Each structure stands twice: as structure tokens, then as C-alpha cells.
Amino acid sequence: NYHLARRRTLQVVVSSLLTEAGFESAEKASVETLTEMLQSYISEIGRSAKSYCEHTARTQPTLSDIVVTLVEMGFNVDTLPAYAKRSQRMVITXXXXXXXXXXXXXXXXXXXXXXXXXXXXXXXXXXXXXXXXXXXXXXXXXXXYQVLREKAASQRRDVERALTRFMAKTGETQSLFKDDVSTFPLIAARPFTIPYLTALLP
Amino acid sequence: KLKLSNTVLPSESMKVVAESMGIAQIQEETCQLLTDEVSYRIKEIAQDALKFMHMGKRQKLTTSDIDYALKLXXXXXXXXXXSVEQQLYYKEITEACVGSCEAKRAEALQSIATDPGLYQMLPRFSTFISEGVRVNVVQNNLALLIYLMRMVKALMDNPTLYLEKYVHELIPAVMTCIVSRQLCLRPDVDNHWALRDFAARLVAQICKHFSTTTNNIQSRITKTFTKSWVDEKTPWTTRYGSIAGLAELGHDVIKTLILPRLQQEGERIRSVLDGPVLSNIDRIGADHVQSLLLKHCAPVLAKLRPPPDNQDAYRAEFGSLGPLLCSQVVKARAQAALQ
């Protein structure tokens, strides 16, 4: 798709030479076919010089080589100065177009860890560890002995006070002050039948 | 499993092409065998050119290819989605969001927009950024706003990471930055209006992708910005964020909405201008807000109506638009002259 611009530049050259001729209208497919014939003629000149200058041990085609090539391909070269009086004096040179660029980027992590490791070749680019390598996750360590047993004894105290409040407000209640429903609702006495089987049971 | 019938051209059209040169009266079977033999030669040259470009190693055939062919009981501990290497890379991303160096800033913005298939430094990343949005709205710092709003911009331009499942904890954090109370200092509100320009510009990039499904995107945000425009006795930061959010939605959105709101907000202009006794923070605040929204709504009316009768167009726009609307119409005519 990107090769098409030079062929259309050759079409612009054909249109400029038709403007030099003086054609107002044209047939577009015939103009493109003559452009194909023109680039095949250029390739035929090139093939002639290619197979022509391999007859020497040298490679470089000179001016007289192209003279013998154009006489071989049927052209009177004596009109080449006079056609100059036309061409580079009556047709304005069109310029080419090539807008190439190199973009910039930055993905600077800090991880290499192997410049020239075991398969040692100093022509490479180790990318990163953020994309290639991986790791493993645990995400849970505390390991604090005194803090752990403080948490355990605090939870034991919480269970003590919770069951204390529960059966404090549940059952028979006699308090310390008058009506300690909120602060200290101590469980009142049951007294039951057989104390020794209960109070001496491991 | 396959049948390769002979592609034979209709011999009557071949007789039309023949008798265009005027040969003779032609029988059918002669042209039939001619189409047969020409089809054999065409398919053999086609096999030759396929051998060429399957040694040229392309599945497409150009003209030049056939031109060269014409040469003839306790469970185990859990593990997060992160690894240690990419969560420290995650910490590099978050601290480059904090990062004062603009070289580290552009490195972070390029890393977010050009890490395709990351997908696992996804939502946990975006989750307490939005909580970090919520805390920093309360903390009210313009620097953390412009860092996170450009960070969403790099998130939106990363083409592989689809937003669809993870939309609905990001968009209200964007809209929270739009509405109100971005007040670092009272003479330093000027940078916040460009933020609301940038934030509504992000919403324009949002709305072109997700409203094909259930209309949270178009219908809810417009009815939010409609009723926020209805909300009287609110600060003008709400009024600027609503209209500029509606301004980024498109040409025809403003054509529907600011067709009655041309003169109705012009009444809001001359309620502010020649209005209160002395409140210069709200005066200078509302004035350039009404100035910016006038000349940004002006290309909507310039594309709709012609720039004739600027005195009558000011009467059609409640006076206060003229001649700044006519000056923007002259600027729109100069922009048309540039084309």
C-alpha cells in the first residue's frame, strides 16, 4: 500500500508531460497503462545495463554504456541536448515526499538480574522482571509472642465479661447498690438441694 | 469434499466482444472451447503466481506478481493475585503518581497506557485510587487531582484493558472532581477550571464506548447535569462543571439543551453582572465561567445559524452574548476561512 506513492508520482510526471504536450482531457486507464509502460521501460533500460555491464569484470555502468544501451533500444541521442531546451526549461520540477520519524518512549523499571548469565552472549536486551518473572505471596505475618498472648487473654476477659453480663441480666438478681441493672447486676442465690455433689465435682 | 467446476464465460457475450471487431457469424462451441482454453491458461498462470508469492511468502497477489509471472482441618494460607515483583512495580506506579519529577511523570503515564494485558494490577489499583480520590476531595489538593485525572487518561488510552466490568467505581470519582468545592485557595481557583475542562474532556472519551448497553452513560449523566443546572442557590463551580460536561458530549447535545438555555443562562449572566453589591470572588468566578461557556457554545450556534444580523442575534441571545458571540462568530468565520 505504501509502494503506491512512487507510482502515483510517476503518474504526476506523465500528467506534467501531457501538460507540456497540451492535452486538456485524457482516458485515465490509458494514462495509468502508459505509466506502467514507462516504468517497464525504465526497468528494461536497467535490465539492459545489468546484462550489458556484466560482460566486463567491472560492475559500474558508465555514460558510454548507456549510450550503447539507448542506441540498442532505438533512440537518437543527438536530440538529448535539444530536448533539454524543452524539458528542464519548460516543465517545473515536482518534489518528492517522505516523512519518516522515530517516536520516543520510556518504560524505565529497575530490574535486570542477568546481564550475561549462563547462555553467555553480549548481544541481547533483558527486558525486566516486571513482565517475565514472577514471585509468591504469603501476606500474613505478625509473630509477636507477648502481643499474641495479650490478645488471647483479652479475648478470655471479653468472654468472661460477656457471659457475666448475659446471665447477670438474665436470671435472679441482687445488686451491690440499689438497682445496679447497668453496672453490677450480680446473680442472686439459687439455694438448691444437694451442695456437695456440685461444689466438689472436678 | 470439493468440486472444481470449469469457470466458463458465457459464449454469447464472447460473441459480442468478437463481433465488436466484426469477424463473422460465429457458432457456440468454438467460443466455448476458446473460453475453456483461455481459462486453462489463466488458472495455470494463477498457480504459477501462487507458487511465486508462497515463495514470496505473502497471501496477497499484486499486479507486479503476475507481471513477473508473465515471463513465458485448617486450610493453607492464601496468596493474592499480585506477585512480589509486580506489587513493587505497583509501588513504583503509585509513588510516580506522587512523583514531582516530570520525567518520572511521563514514564508513569507511558507505562499505564502501554502495558497491554496487565489485567492483574487492575481493580485493586483503581479501587483505592478512587478512595484516594474521595480522601483528597476532602483534603482539597489540586496537585493530587491533576495527577489522578491524567492517570485515568492513561488508563483510558490503554486499549487491551477493557473498562466494562470495572466501570462503576471510577465514573462517580471522576464526576466528584467535576462538581464542586475544589478550593485550595480562593485566588487559586483558576487552575481548577482547567481541571474541569480536562475532566469533562475525559467524559467525552468515556461516553463514546459504553452507552450501547444500559444507559447509565448517556441518560443518567445528562439527567444529573440537567437537574444540577436546575439546582438554584449552588456555587457556580456546579454550574460550570455541568454545562462543560454537557459541552463535551457533542454538537447536537448542546443544540438540544442550550436552545432554551441560550437566553435563560443569559438571564443568569445579567443576574450576576449588574447584580449583587460586593462579592468579588463569586463575581470574577462566575464572569469568566460565563465568558468561557459563551464562546465555547458559540460554534454550536455558528454551525446552526449564519452570522448575519449581529444586533438581532444579540436580541435572540438576550443581549449579553452580543457582541462577544458576534466576535466569536467572526472568529468562527475566520476559522472557516482557514479551511
DSSP per position, B299-324: HHHHHHS-S--HHHHHHTTTTTSTTH
Experimental approach was cryo-EM
Contacts 24+ apart (CB under 8 A), B284-291: B285/B189, B285/B236, B285/B237, B286/B236, B286/B239, B288/B193, B289/B193, B289/B236, B289/B239, B289/B240, B290/B265, B290/B320, B291/B324
* DSSP state for residue B208 in the 8-state scheme: T
Residue type, B289: V
Give the three cell numbers for residue A93.
Answer: 520540477
Alpha-carbon span B198 to B149, nearest angstrom:
8
* Chain A partners within 8 Å of B107 (Cβ): 106-108
Coil, strand, or helix at residue B233? coil
Instruction: Work out the angle at residue B22's Cα, subtended by the Cα atoms of residues B16 and B26, and round it to the nearest 5 degrees.
Output: 60
Q: Which residues pair with A173 in a beta bridge?
A: A187
Environment class of residue B257 by beta-carbon count within 10 Å: exposed (0-12), middle (13-18) or buried (19+)?
A: buried
Environment class of residue A83 by beta-carbon count within 10 Å: exposed (0-12), middle (13-18) or buried (19+)?
A: exposed
User: Hunting for cell 554504456 — which residue is that?
Assistant: A65
Contact B173, B164 (CB under 8 A): no
Give the three cell numbers for residue B42.
Answer: 489463466
Alpha-carbon span B184 to B191, nearest angstrom:
10
Give the three cell numbers for residue B293.
Answer: 461557556
Task: Report the gap between the CA of B88 and the closest CA in chain A (Å).
Answer: 9
* Chain B partners within 8 Å of A107 (Cβ): 107, 110-111, 114
Angle between helix axes A63-72 and A28-52 (nearest 10 degrees) is 120
The residues, any chain, with a CB within 8 Å of residue B298's CB and separated by 6 or more, are B325, B328, B329, B332
Alpha-carbon span B302 to B149, nearest angstrom:
32
> Which value, in Å, is the radius of gyration of the alpha carbons in chain B?
33
* DSSP state for residue B217 in the 8-state scheme: I
Alpha-carbon span B324 to B113, nearest angstrom:
40
Give me the count of residues in chain B.
Answer: 339
Please choose, from the candidates B223, B129, B231, B245, the residue with its C-alpha nearest in 3D space to the C-alpha of residue B178.
Answer: B245
* Chain B partners within 8 Å of A6 (Cβ): none
Alpha-carbon span A130 to A127, nearest angstrom:
9
Q: Provide the CA A179 distance to its chain's centre, in angstroms.
A: 75
Alpha-carbon span A77 to A47, nearest angstrom:
19
User: Hunting for cell 519548460 — which residue is that?
Assistant: A90
Cα–Cα distances (Å) from A157 to A166, A180, A202, B139, in that order, read: 14, 21, 23, 40
Give me the count of residues in chain A.
Answer: 202
Contact B257, B199 (CB under 8 A): no
CB atoms closer than 10 angstroms to residue A182? 8
CB atoms closer than 10 angstroms to residue B259? 13
Q: Which of A105, A130, A138 sits opposite B85 (nearest CB)?
A: A130
User: Hunting for cell 441518560 — which residue is that?
Assistant: B219
Q: Which of B79, B92, B107 sits opposite A136 (nearest CB)?
A: B79
User: Hunting for cell 450556534 — which residue is that?
Assistant: B301
* Chain A partners within 8 Å of B96 (Cβ): none
Chain breaks in chain B (C to N over 2.5 A) after: 72
User: Given in angstroms, what resolution was this structure solved at?
Assistant: 7.5
Task: Report the gap between the CA of B129 and the closest CA in chain A (Å).
Answer: 21
Please choose, from the candidates B144, B151, B244, the residue with its C-alpha nearest in 3D space to the C-alpha of residue B193.
Answer: B244
Phi-psi category of residue B142: left, alpha or beta, with phi > 0 → left and psi -120 to 50 → alpha? alpha
Pick the residue from chain B with its C-alpha nearest to A37: B67
Q: Which residues pair with A187 in a beta bridge?
A: A173
Pick the residue from chain A with its C-alpha nearest to B104: A108
Give the three cell numbers for residue B148.
Answer: 489522578
Instruction: Work out the angle at residue A45's Cα, subtended by the Cα atoms of residues A44 and A49, and round it to the nearest 5 degrees.
Output: 115
Task: Report the gap between the CA of A110 and the closest CA in chain B (Å).
Answer: 9
Q: Which of B68, B87, B111 is the best substitution to test chain A (most A C-beta atoms within 10 A)? A: B111
The residues, any chain, with a CB within 8 Å of residue A96's CB and separated by 6 or more, are A9
Q: How many CA atoms lie within 13 A of B210 on its CB side?
A: 21
| Helix residue ranges per DSSP H, chain B | 11-19, 28-53, 63-68, 84-98, 102-113, 124-139, 142-156, 171-179, 190-206, 221-230, 236-247, 251-257, 261-272, 280-304, 310-315, 324-338
* CA-based end-to-end distance of chain A: 96
Q: Give the phi and the psi of residue B138 in degrees, each rounded to 5.
A: -65, -40
Give the three cell numbers for residue A63.
Answer: 555514460
The residues, any chain, with a CB within 8 Å of residue A86's CB and separated by 6 or more, are A20
Alpha-carbon span B269 to B260, nearest angstrom:
14
* DSSP state for residue B69 in the 8-state scheme: T
Coil, strand, or helix at residue B185? coil
Please choose, from the candidates B194, B117, B126, the residue with its C-alpha nearest in 3D space to the C-alpha of residue B161.
Answer: B117
* CA-based end-to-end distance of chain B: 59
CB atoms closer than 10 angstroms to residue A53? 16
Alpha-carbon span B69 to B54, nearest angstrom:
13
Q: Give the phi and the psi of residue B302 in degrees, each rounded to 5.
A: -70, -40
Contact B146, B102 (CB under 8 A): no
Give the number of A-B residue pairs with CB atoms closer than 8 Å.
43
Give the three cell numbers for residue B297.
Answer: 457554545
Q: Which of B83, B103, B114 sits opposite A137 (nearest CB)?
A: B83
Give the three cell numbers for residue B301.
Answer: 450556534
Alpha-carbon span B96 to B89, nearest angstrom:
10
Cα–Cα distances (Å) from B74 to A139, A142, B77, in that order, read: 17, 18, 9
Q: How many CA atoms lie within 13 A of B184 on its CB side?
A: 15
Work out whether the CA dihedral B209, B212, B214, B215 comes out positive or negative: positive
Coil, strand, or helix at residue B197? helix
Alpha-carbon span A16 to A95, nearest angstrom:
13
Alpha-carbon span A15 to B129, nearest angstrom:
61
Give the three cell numbers for residue B260.
Answer: 432554551
Helix (H), strand (E) at residue B72: none
Task: Write the DSSP string, chain A.
Answer: -TTHHHHHHHHHHHHHHHHHHT-S---HHHHHHHHHHHHHHHHHHHHHHHHHTTSSS-----HHHHHHHHHHTT--GGGHHHHHHHHHHHSPPPP-------------------SS-SS--SS-----SSSS------------HHHHHHHHHHHHHHHHHHHHHHHHHHS-B--SSS--SSS---B-----S-SHHHHT--
Coil, strand, or helix at residue B10? coil
Task: Report the gap between the CA of B174 and the closest CA in chain A (Å).
Answer: 27
- Does the distance separating the beta carbons of B80 and A107 come in below 8 Å? no
Cα-Cα-Cα-Cα torsion A153, A154, A160, A161, nearest 10 degrees, comes to 160
User: Hunting for cell 480562593 — which residue is that?
Assistant: B186
Task: Report the gap between the CA of B150 and the closest CA in chain A (Å).
Answer: 17
